[PDB]
Amino acid sequence: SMSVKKPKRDDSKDLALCSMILTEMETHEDAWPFLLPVNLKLVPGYKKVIKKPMDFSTIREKLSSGQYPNLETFALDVRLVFDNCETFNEDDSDIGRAGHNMRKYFEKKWTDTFK
């Protein structure tokens, strides 16, 4: 509350560390469905169904230009990528499996880097 604060967690490395995580996600062999925005002209249904499209290249640009206020807003966009994928893709498809794999990979790196 006013003039009453918990001890200051050091957040000075968060930007660098989210960039490293994002590099590791970008270079994973199963990243290919997620590297670029879904082409809304060429993929029927996507525009109407997926209210907030997100992809690794869009996260990279937001990261690089100070559009994440804190590390939690960064994780919310990474998770959005996988939540969108599960909304649109069957679990038993190459893309569906890719999304599960990547979400697992992300959540481990997130825990090991920050928790």
Experimental method: X-ray
How far is the C-alpha of 97 from the C-alpha of 6, rounded, in Å? 41
User: Do 50 and 67 touch, CB atoms closer than 8 A?
Assistant: no
Residues, the chain: 115
Domains of the chain (ranges, CATH numbers): 1-115 (1.20.920.10)
How far is the C-alpha of 19 from the C-alpha of 23, rounded, in Å? 6
Hey, what's the torsion of the CAs at 96, 20, 77, 106, to 10 degrees? Answer: 40
E-assigned strand segments in 31-112: none
How far is the C-alpha of 52 from the C-alpha of 31, rounded, in Å? 19
CA distances from residue 110 to 24, 47, 51, 79, 90 in whole angstroms, order as listed: 12, 30, 25, 11, 26
* Contacts by residues 49-53 (CB-CB < 8 Å, ≥ 24 positions apart): 49/87, 49/88, 50/84, 50/87, 50/88, 52/80, 52/84, 53/84
CA distances from residue 28 to 42, 90, 98, 112 in whole angstroms, order as listed: 25, 21, 10, 18
